[PDB]
Ligand binder design. Structure first.
Ligand code: NAD
Ligand code: NAD
Ligand code: NAD
Ligand code: NAD
Ligand code: QT8
Ligand code: QT8
Ligand code: QT8
Ligand code: QT8
Ligand code: QT8
Lengths: 260, 261, 260, 260
């Protein structure tokens, strides 16, 4: 079964972690994938690997805060694969700090990448998806789009914001056969989080396994990291023709974090 | 093709009609062994037998979900027949629309007993089976009416709100036991229940059936369409599958954008 | 100085805890209060102490699960004070158990008192409030109306349901000068909770302080019990003429619990 | 009774609409109020009116996007009234358009004023409020912080974001006697909205009453505009010492909008 057979998916931040797994899993589902990241070296390598494995893949690097570059990356996608069926707004980063020590510029950058970048993508894929009366837009958000976490003023503001953007975008294209959803993971086993576990274990002087099980997963009822494979499986369902009635939703995959 | 529920036993309450019946047929196509449980023991036997004629593993285990003794025995019959319960779908329900002042208390209590207490009884009697095997999928068929209000639906919206409360408690109690508990929340599905309500509104208002649907039911639906039972079954398959082990405690919404505005 | 002057407040479960405080504080704001509880002797002495302080108080005991007694308690209020302006559906109780050890009858009872009780109160005051084009209904819920907690299947199901009833009721009287809101406290310093701290302290062989600071309040960002007066102050605001634009809301007072 | 006696309130955008009402109502409840807006003559005019009526008021204009100006306005307040007890992040604007014809720079501007402006305000009052272990921060949001509305990508993104910032901020100061809440009105009777009724009546060739009652209020159960007075009354309660237990909340007054 090829759930995304020949569907054209553009995935921002797809050179690492969740975005890279989505791209691999989408290709295996039969999607034509576009690897898009800051790092144009890792983009070209990723797309070349996929091509060598017999997949349709394109390197179209861009900074999602660079509207002109994001625009041309979509136009390159149209020229290569004819259309865009699926946009995954996945590009992001993290800066943890008390509000008092939280540089305004860093706050503005978290918002620009993870909110304005999503808005820029939606703005330039909407005409393609409305012309063909089909589309799937997934904004990679977080449970931090639904609840608060101390030290994450910029991240939680950006992810809250992309849930509002998701709902506005959904309402504007609900008649055009296009869905816009925010996939909200909890803690995922990624380089980023393995970094934070690394950080916690030195800064608290506990083991890597104690940093994970006693602090990172203390408020996770399943007491486990989500796999990138699980996130990509939900993304595949929402991006499929079978999820046409799901739109305007903060779709939560969090091992019960927000249930308590 | 693939069998997303291969090797799993699915007990589905209210599975002799509408959404329950589509879930049972689609779960079977995904390689689940399905138990058709409903009030109408006649339609259950016929449903299960028709599935069996199409090469599927189906059991007729009729019960009234408000009858804890009959529910417990329907679960026991499933264990005896298939060995275990992997997936419980709490889907049995009904509707009674009236202003609160003309809403009989007993009808309010019955709506709550069937759609809330019924889901509680099901959960209490599958939990030990699922916990001993460290695997389970519990889906409560709630509604967007579990998350928002609608005038005249005091009993329904009260039961469906409550079943989302019960989903969260259950999810927290079995989070470490490889069991998920979710509330699948449809908006308007093209079913007998809903086609009945369109006829009602069209009589009482003396508009045409298309007028009642398009001007009243679908006014609030951004997608301006009824969902298909197939769409609900497809979400139910994903949540009931091994692929969704990290989804729990959730009101999972498929509503054509209804709660987005 | 008198935010409820000339208003008639019917308060279920007002013989103890939050309901008792709401009755006393509502009287101070110039409301005529009906003390209604299971224990008729405590309703009489409460109403009498209030009367000795120059307040207008009526004893109207009932079991809120007894629609005939509830209906007769409302009728007696109409007979004595001319109308019901404010209904406080406050009557409740708690039973904590794993779902496996949770008796179905106890589950049903929790739902009958805290959901059905509320439906019965609302059904019998709505015609009175709709006739005068003025009402304030407050369903005393809990953050357990909004999130899950292990061992509270019955209570969390009842409280979730009363938020559902609250939004339905609100929509049905929105044009009639009536509001219907669910006040949702976190942990409040009441006999009920002081009981639960004493319980936890024996069960875990810890101080009363440790049971409170380290178990009860570990999920409360403010790390404190709410006072019954704080709950009463929010109840007075929502029950006052100044809150006519608040309806259909789960109004949360929880020292930040639901923010995490 | 003066509910904010001896409190200093800093209100951004207080030269007009909800902010102006909050300043005049906070003054009547005994707050020293700071009038801060873009319009510097209107702030001096407003503050002078309150002074003539026996009220403590200070003009301290600033663009909330100008962190250096906002920091100096908070400093001027410290110099004049000793401290800041209450911050009302109120400054906002609106721009309605489909995503495709929604200028990226306008989207950025809505977020910069209504999310980043609040971040800057919170960042510079938190050390003052933490030092004295007392504070009240109210971010004026909107039901558009909780649901989607077609054509308001920028506004709904910004309001969604400010609720995220509210929950983060609440968690960072929950132990410090500081509450952070987002007050979320539906349609309020303001120059802003009357403007919008004027536009709908003209661009749809219908009466002002047609355009309000049949279009703007179509999704409002109470079928009425809220008053600036109603918003101010909830703002006063939230900002009072009586609301110490309310924090990290999206506090909704929407005549039932979000109940359906
Ligand atoms: N990993 C988690 O635990 C977790 C939790 C919840 C949700 N998410 C969200 O999912 C997304 C994936 O994060 P991840 O874990 O894969 O992190 P990661 O660090 O592995 O990958 C992030 C990628 O984003 C790229 N990027 C950053 N800014 C960019 C920009 N302006 N334009 C283009 N590319 C840019 C980086 O180059 C990098 O390759 C993020 O938005 C994150 O907030 C992650
Ligand atoms: N149809 C929709 O648009 C829609 C939308 C949202 C929610 N739902 C929910 O999805 C579920 C399925 O709805 P539906 O319209 O297919 O059917 P329904 O709600 O009318 O009930 C379906 C089945 O439940 C059975 N049933 C009723 N009471 C029972 C009892 N006490 N014990 C056992 N079985 C009993 C009936 O015999 C029927 O076959 C229900 O919970 C409903 O509330 C439906
Ligand atoms: N205590 C808390 O921390 C807390 C937190 C969240 C919500 N609540 C809710 O607020 C309300 C008040 O709680 P409390 O702590 O003051 O409770 P409490 O147990 O101290 O007092 C409740 C009163 O209700 C009465 N009552 C019980 N069943 C009744 C019935 N069927 N009919 C009439 N009266 C009945 C009892 O006799 C008692 O006087 C309850 O609904 C409770 O669930 C309390
Ligand atoms: N109007 C409504 O019904 C409604 C409903 C929901 C929310 N709100 C919110 O309430 C608040 C007040 O709205 P209003 O109706 O009083 O509008 P208004 O236009 O009368 O008030 C807005 C004020 O903010 C000022 N302002 C704009 N940008 C600024 C900046 N960068 N720095 C400083 N001041 C700036 C303007 O000069 C103006 O005085 C806004 O945040 C708005 O989003 C309004
Ligand atoms: C959303 C949880 C998370 O992973 C935020 C972050 O640390 O990037
Ligand atoms: C949730 C839609 C529905 O099924 C309510 C009803 O029965 O009218
Ligand atoms: C003993 C529990 C309770 O107080 C319920 C009732 O009054 O019927
Ligand atoms: C916080 C809800 C509640 O009241 C649980 C309890 O009974 O202590
Ligand atoms: C309804 C919230 C609001 O005030 C947005 C607008 O219409 O300006």
């Amino acid at each position: 079964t090829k759930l995304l057979d020949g569907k054209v998916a553009f995935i921002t931040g797809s050179a690492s972690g969740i975005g890279l797994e989505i791209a691999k899993k989408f290709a295996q589902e039969g999607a034509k994938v576009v690897i898009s990241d800051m790092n144009a070296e890792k983009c070209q390598e990723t797309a070349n690997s996929l091509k060598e494995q017999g997949f349709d893949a394109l390197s179209a690097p861009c900074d999602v805060t660079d509207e002109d570059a994001y625009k041309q990356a979509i136009e390159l996608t149209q020229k290569t694969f004819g259309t865009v069926d699926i946009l995954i707004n996945n590009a992001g980063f993290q800066h943890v700090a008390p509000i008092e020590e939280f540089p305004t510029a860093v706050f503005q950058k978290l918002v620009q990448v993870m909110l304005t970048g999503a808005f820029i993508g939606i703005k330039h894929v909407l005409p393609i998806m409305k012309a063909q009366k089909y589309g799937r837009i997934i904004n990679m958000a977080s449970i931090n789009g639904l609840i608060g976490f101390a030290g994450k003023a910029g991240y939680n503001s950006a992810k809250h914001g992309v849930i509002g953007l998701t709902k506005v975008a959904a309402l504007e294209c609900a008649r055009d056969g296009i869905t816009v959803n925010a996939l909200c993971p909890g803690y995922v086993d990624t380089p980023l989080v393995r970094g934070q576990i690394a950080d916690l274990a030195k800064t608290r002087n506990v083991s890597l396994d104690s940093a994970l099980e006693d602090v990172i997963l203390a408020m996770v009822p399943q007491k486990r990291l989500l796999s990138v494979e699980e996130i990509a499986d939900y993304a595949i369902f929402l991006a499929s023709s079978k999820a046409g009635g799901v739109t305007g939703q903060a779709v939560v995959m969090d091992g019960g974090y927000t249930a308590q």
